[PDB]
Amino acid sequence: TVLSVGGQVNLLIQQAIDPKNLSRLFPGWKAWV
């Protein structure tokens, strides 16, 4: 940890790798049925 931004950038990749939650809050699931 030091001037390392890979912390927020990496974080953004993980959430983006598990959009099952946000997707559930959007029509994204009306097709996953």
Curated annotation (Swiss-Prot):
A motif (Microbody targeting signal) lies at residues 23-25. Found in pancreas, kidney, skeletal muscle, liver, lung, placenta, brain, heart, spleen, thymus, testis, ovary, small intestine, colon and leukocytes. Induction: By ionizing radiation. Changing residue 24 to Q: Abolished interaction with PEX5 and translocation to peroxisomes in response to reactive oxygen species (ROS). Residues 1-33 form the FATC domain. Serine/threonine protein kinase which activates checkpoint signaling upon double strand breaks (DSBs), apoptosis and genotoxic stresses such as ionizing ultraviolet A light (UVA), thereby acting as a DNA damage sensor. Recognizes the substrate consensus sequence [ST]-Q. Phosphorylates 'Ser-139' of histone variant H2AX at double strand breaks (DSBs), thereby regulating DNA damage response mechanism. The FATC domain is required for interaction with KAT5. It is linked to Ataxia telangiectasia: A rare recessive disorder characterized by progressive cerebellar ataxia, dilation of the blood vessels in the conjunctiva and eyeballs, immunodeficiency, growth retardation and sexual immaturity. Patients have a strong predisposition to cancer; about 30% of patients develop tumors, particularly lymphomas and leukemias. Cells from affected individuals are highly sensitive to damage by ionizing radiation and resistant to inhibition of DNA synthesis following irradiation. This is Serine-protein kinase ATM. The chain holds residues 3024 to 3056 of 3056 of the full protein.
